[PDB]
Amino acid sequence: ETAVVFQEKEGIVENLFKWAREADQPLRTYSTGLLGGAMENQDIAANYRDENSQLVAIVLRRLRELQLQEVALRQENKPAIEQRLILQYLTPLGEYQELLPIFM
């Protein structure tokens, strides 16, 4: 709901930076949305208004490769559930300020 990512057990906010930049690819397959309740929160979006901007640079570059992955696989006769859940991360914190610059 709100607070399991917000409570004094708050290392999982920092651990998901380790569990995205260093995790396994089947672990990263479901690791992305785990900060969703953090980004639905305004306070962690305020407590990590700049530290998430590290992670947005990681997840956007991986997001671009899927069009080089999936479309080129379809470009052979002429997995995206990660990409489904990757965009589930970016949806709450895409509205906030100071993230639009690296978005553009």
Added chain:
Amino acid sequence: AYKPMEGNFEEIARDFNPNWMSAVEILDDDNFLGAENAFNLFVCQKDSAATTDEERQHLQEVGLFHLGEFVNVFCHGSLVMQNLPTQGSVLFGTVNGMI
């Protein structure tokens, strides 16, 4: 501020002391000169030891002076010959003809 990559403005800092303005002029992108209805001049300064966000949103008044005259205008530009001392030149225009 103006962050062109952000597309909007931004409050860098602000002086809090209620002085009734008459005329302002930027001096050297660090120091800011202002005029007052109480016939006075003062320079504010963007702060340097920005140890927190509260100590960097507060402009500091560096310098106070009673130019006993009401300042309307400020402008750049000297009135003497450029022969190519001090740095910069700000003239001002008042209500008694005192440049």
